[PDB]
Amino acid sequence: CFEPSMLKKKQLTVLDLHPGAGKTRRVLPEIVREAIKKRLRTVILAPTRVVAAEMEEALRGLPVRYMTTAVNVTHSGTEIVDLMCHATFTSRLLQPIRVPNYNLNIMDEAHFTDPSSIAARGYISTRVEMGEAAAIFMTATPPGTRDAFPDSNSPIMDTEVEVPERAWSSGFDWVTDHSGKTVWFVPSVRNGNEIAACLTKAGKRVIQLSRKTFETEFQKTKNQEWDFVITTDISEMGANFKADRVIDSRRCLKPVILDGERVILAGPMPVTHASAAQRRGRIGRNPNKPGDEYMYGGGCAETDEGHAHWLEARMLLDNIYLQDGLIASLYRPEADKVAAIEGEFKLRTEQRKTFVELMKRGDLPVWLAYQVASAGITYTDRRWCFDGTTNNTIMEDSVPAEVWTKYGEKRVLKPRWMDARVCSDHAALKSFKEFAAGKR
């Protein structure tokens, strides 16, 4: 549980109650009330805008400044408690914007493996180690967890079973014979597309979720009748469903940097124990409803090792001012996950601005944004999208993708640096084509 002693400077506490135990809805407001009593300048970090909106409900009445348009409230001026998304925190730290030296740093769903969340944990844990601050990381699955089957509010039926990853017609009757509501974790948007299409043809009502569609589509899980939610790993971060079954492929894609020169999406390959526990954790949450089902289609492995997100986190952290020339280290339990030289990605003022703009407005992956900024290219200079090797040709429906450049010339998309995440699904490619065309 929480104790006021956890609010003392130099304290970092991992509140690791099992999934559903009440960390976000019960323990968080307790902490916040105590922080306010103690006049502690406090930041609450929500993984997503959806979760931020839910927190406003659990925190209602309390004087919290919601630094998100996801929440519709008139703020007073009392507020010494701020709430923002993980990514917003890290983004503000990278920009010349002033962010308070928060006395207390509360990160909910602190297992989130997005680069900006990893970087935020590194920054926060370094501030605490410096003796400057306290921190509470709230997650059922702290870094390095080896338990894929933690406690739950009610008993879960765990079953190892072959899970389809492609359209099927026979041999998987248990999937469609089910009468309730299923959350199905897939390794990618495209894989989810195929499974969704198959289910829809079988007469099921399907909602699909991924990182860029999560806000709009998640509301459909409330506003619309559904049989299946097909989701990527984004739903591991405190997403609440009224479901009675989870189907878990136990698979994910792993961005991997090859030879420091390109990023591939490796796999699909096993999820971590933490990811598996969070996926399973979507059900068994109602103590009055035993027998929720968890079907899983493979084992776990430590696939965060060598995963690009921890290298990308270093790129972010190398560019956040801490004190003089010091550079914050990653949070200790996840600091092995990357082989990097601390400070090696530090950029000077102008290149850092370019780096930030390429990630924000550019919506480029961190790794790719870094290659461009560190090469001395300015944000609006898109010549690099076209002057790569033939091997870097991006394909769309089996034919090289083409755009009209801002000069009006039709050119094949051949980026100088290839990051597979810019074309891993239709939406990603659409966005990158707009970028290469100078439209953003």
Ligand X SMILES: Nc1ncnc2c1ncn2[C@@H]1O[C@H](COP(=O)(O)OP(=O)(O)NP(=O)(O)O)[C@@H](O)[C@H]1O
Residues that bind ligand X (CB under 6 A): 17, 19-26, 140, 153, 238, 240, 281, 285-286
414 is in an annotated binding site: no
C-alpha 107/C-alpha 44 separation (Å) is 6
18 is in an annotated binding site: yes
Nearer to ligand X, 192 or 238 (CB): 238
Q: What is the DSSP secondary structure assignment for residue 87, as one 8-state letter?
A: H
Token pair of 306, please?
Answer: 């060598």
23 is in an annotated binding site: yes
196 is in an annotated binding site: no
Q: Is 351 in the site for Mn ion (CB under 5 A)?
A: no
337 burial via Cβ count (<10 Å: 0-12, 13-18, 19+): buried
Residue nearest to Mn ion (CB): 24
Q: How far is the CB of 23 from ligand X (least distance, A)?
A: 4
Q: How far is the CB of 153 from ligand X (least distance, A)?
A: 5
C-alpha 57/C-alpha 399 separation (Å) is 49
19 is in an annotated binding site: yes
Token pair of 203, please?
Answer: 């007469």
Strands 399-400 and 395-396: antiparallel
Q: How far is the CB of 335 from ligand X (least distance, A)?
A: 24
Q: Is 281 in the site for Mn ion (CB under 5 A)?
A: no
Of residues 7, 15, 21, 24, which one binds Mn ion by CB under 5 A? Answer: 24
388 is in an annotated binding site: no
Q: How far is the CB of 179 from ligand X (least distance, A)?
A: 22
C-alpha 248/C-alpha 245 separation (Å) is 10
Of residues 20, 187, 238, 270, which one binds Mn ion by CB under 5 A? Answer: 238
| DSSP secondary structure, 102-166, as one string | -SEEEEESTT--SHHHHHHHHHHHHHHHHTS-EEEEE-SS-TT---SS---SS-EEEEE----SS
Residue nearest to ligand X (CB): 20
Q: Is 153 in the site for Mn ion (CB under 5 A)?
A: no
Binding residues for ATP, by number, are 17-24
The footprint of Mn ion (CB under 5 A) covers: 23-24, 238
Binding residues, by number, are 17-24
